[PDB]
C-alpha cells in the first residue's frame, strides 16, 4: 500500500507528551471532517491562523467580530487543547482606524507637539482597550499570548511601524502590562518574531527584551515563528537562539513552524505535487529529523511547538509560491501531504 493516512498512525503530541505541546494553526472551516479528526488525534494545542488578528476581531472601533475566534476556542475546549493567541499587537493585519486622528488623517503626519502627545495617548488607550476586551473574553482559554508580534526590523533595530513612530517602545511596554493586568499573574506573555535564528536579529530581540525586563515589563517568553526551509537556517543558529533567550530566564516556543521546499523567494516552484522529486521530501525528512532532535535535546527550555497548518493542501506557502511564479506553484512544508498521508518527515519525527 501507499503511505498510511494521518489518522492511522501514532499521534505526534503523544510522542512528545513529556517534552512540549504539539500544535497546529487552524481556520474555523477546518474543524470538521478529516482535518478535525487529524487535529483531535495529533495535536494538543491550537492557534488561530487569522481569526484572532486585530483586524479580524475589531475591524471597526467597537464593532467586535467574535464568531470565527469563538468557534476555534470551542473546539479547543471540547478536545482539551492548549490555545495560543495570534496576536494582540502587530504592525500588520491591524485596522487602519487605530492610527487615524480625530480629524480623519493619519497620526504619523501630525507636527504639533501637544497634538502628537495627545495622539500617543489616544492610540495607547485604543490598544489598551483592544487588549483588555480580548483578554477578558479569552483569559480562561488562552494558555500563551503573543502580546506583540514582529517588532524587530530585519535591517536592524526596532521596526519603525506606525506603532513605533507614535509611541516609541511604549506600545510594547503598555501591551505587556495590560495583558498581565487583565490576564492575571498566570497568563503566559510572549514576544513573537520570525528569523529569530539570524544572529543579528536574535541579538536585537535579546537586547530589547533584556532592557524591557529590567524596567519590570512582564515578559514570560519568546516565540520563534520558524518559517524555515530545507536549506536554511542552520541547526547551530537555531540552538544558539533558543539558548540565548533561556539564559534570560525566558520560555521558548516554536510558533509558526513550516519548512518550505524552496529558498527565498520561492522562484521556480513546482506546479504540481506529482512533479516534486522524492529527493526533496527525503532532504525535508533529514531536516525535520535533526530539528526535532534539537527540540528534544532542549525540551526543558521549550514548552510548545506549533506547525503553521495541518497538511500540505492548506498553507500560506502556496500563496507565496503563486506570488513568485505568476499565479501557479505549490509548496509542501508539513509531515502530512496534500492527501493527508504521512510523509518521510513524519517517520523521522515520530522516532
Ligand atoms: Mg518543555
Ligand atoms: Mg527523529
From TrEMBL:
The protein's enzyme class: hydrolase
Binding residues for Mg(2+) 1: 19, 299, 302
UniProt entry keywords in alphabetical sequence: Carbohydrate metabolism, Glycosidase, Hydrolase, Metal-binding, Polysaccharide degradation, Signal, Xylan degradation
One GO term of the biological process aspect: xylan catabolic process
Active-site residues, as the UniProt record annotates them: 256
Coiled-coil intervals, chain numbering: none
Entry's EC annotation: 3.2.1.8
Catalytic reaction equation(s): Endohydrolysis of (1->4)-beta-D-xylosidic linkages in xylans
Domain called GH10: residue spans: 6-351
Single Gene Ontology MF annotation: endo-1,4-beta-xylanase activity
Binding site for Mg(2+) 2: 289, 293, 348, 351
Involved pathway(s): Glycan degradation; xylan degradation
Family listed: Belongs to the glycosyl hydrolase 10 (cellulase F) family.
Protein name (Swiss-Prot/TrEMBL): Beta-xylanase
